[PDB]
Amino acid sequence: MKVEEILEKALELVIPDEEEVRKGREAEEELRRRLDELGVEYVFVGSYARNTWLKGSLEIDVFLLFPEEFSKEELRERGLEIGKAVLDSYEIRYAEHPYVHGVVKGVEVDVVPCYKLKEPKNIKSAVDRTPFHHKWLEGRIKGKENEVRLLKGFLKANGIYGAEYKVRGFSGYLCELLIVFYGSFLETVKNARRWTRRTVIDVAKGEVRKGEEFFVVDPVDEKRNVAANLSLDNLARFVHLCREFMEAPSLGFFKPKHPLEIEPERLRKIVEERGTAVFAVKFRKPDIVDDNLYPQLERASRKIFEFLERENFMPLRSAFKASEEFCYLLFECQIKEISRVFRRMGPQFEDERNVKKFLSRNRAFRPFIENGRWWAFEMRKFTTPEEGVRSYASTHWHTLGKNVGESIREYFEIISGEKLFKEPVTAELCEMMGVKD
RNA sequence: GGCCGCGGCAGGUUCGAGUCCUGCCGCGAUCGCCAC
């Protein structure tokens, strides 16, 4: 009921249980056993090493430390060969430079090669920042681990946790910085309410000042923004969430939300009461990781949104969805039908040459002068939003993002009305329209 | 690998288009971002 007891109740939700903690130490003792077996210099980093890792989020990260006499050549190769002999099931994923994902005694493991460096300079790759982040926090985070998890869980419940493009929220490392800055979970929430889009937080300097952008200065890298990939709208949501919490704090703030799935009938009544045009672009999911797909579905939805906008259909909102098979680009427009004719602007009556040319073109209706310049009645190729997007997506598929636009080129369909409500987009359509209980 | 920001080239549209379409090359050796 009070603020005090809520935070402790919530702890249970964010804190790994002992057998989860246990899973991690065994896999840590074995890993550390295999490298001391193969005698490589290393360091453990990340949420696990700082004991800040979130419940059910367990991942062991291990950085392999190479002298600077080497290059990517010994890094890529002999960074892979070390992973194979230790990891049980090795899945090789990529980054700027490739690393080795996998498992050891049930626990997930990431093994990332890098340089043995002094000081936070000569830093090129972003995988190089990672161990220095740890050295910095390791000392300042000791004892505040639980405050960190509280912040993380609060965010992850509201869907803004993590910096991947699927989220564009607050990265874990950023959370750790905040608690080190504001001292605890609560004070962060207390303080976040007063943040602005121009807020600069210099962690290392104990300073908050006004910038050109919302900026968290990496203690390690004074030029880098730890908050770089946080979207404005997600910061706006966080500030909005912090205020709500302080006004009326409840445990609900730490509990993951319902999708709000609605029945297609009641949903049929809403769309008809709004009297809007609700339609969707359906196509097969490109086989690509989400951090490619999602940024593209964002772009695709934008290019088409701007189109309906440019085309005077008065779009309201756009969304998207990724199922296992299909991807959906969602739209709602104020305009279900527009007239066949419009007004193109002509040249000023004074302008001889350009007027002769404007008045020559074959048009079904006679042009006219209004406010000292010529206007003509013209004819659009499509009178409805669904028609224009068919037209637009078909010709312009290539600007819809590489991989998404390519699948849209090789197939796609426009859904609306009852067939639309049959698709597994019902939750998204609700958020888009802002449907209540 | 993709997104994003720029720079350049050739074509389209339009009465005209530095602002829109289109495709191409280049750029991120002071870090753009994401493999959370």
From Swiss-Prot:
A GO MF term: tRNA binding
Keyword set includes RNA-binding: yes
InterPro entries: CAA_C, CCA-adding_arc, CCA_tRNA_nucleotrans_2, NT_2-5OAS_ClassI-CCAase, NT_sf, NuclTrfase_I-like_C, Polymerase_NTP_transf_dom, tRNA_NucTransf2
Listed result of changing residue 110 to A: High decrease in both AMP and CMP incorporation
Residues annotated as binding ATP: 47, 50, 133, 152, 161
Cofactor: Mg(2+)
Outcome following mutation: residue 133 to A: No decrease in both AMP and CMP incorporation
Self-association and partners: Homodimer.
NCBIfam families, per the entry: cca_archaeal
Miscellaneous comment in the UniProt entry for this protein: A single active site specifically recognizes both ATP and CTP and is responsible for their addition. In contrast to the eubacterial homologs, the specificity of the nucleotide-binding pocket is determined by both the enzyme and the tRNA.
Reported function: Catalyzes the addition and repair of the essential 3'-terminal CCA sequence in tRNAs without using a nucleic acid template. Adds these three nucleotides in the order of C, C, and A to the tRNA nucleotide-73, using CTP and ATP as substrates and producing inorganic pyrophosphate. tRNA 3'-terminal CCA addition is required both for tRNA processing and repair. Also involved in tRNA surveillance by mediating tandem CCA addition to generate a CCACCA at the 3' terminus of unstable tRNAs. While stable tRNAs receive only 3'-terminal CCA, unstable tRNAs are marked with CCACCA and rapidly degraded.
Protein name according to UniProt: CCA-adding enzyme
Species this protein is from: Archaeoglobus fulgidus (strain ATCC 49558 / DSM 4304 / JCM 9628 / NBRC 100126 / VC-16)
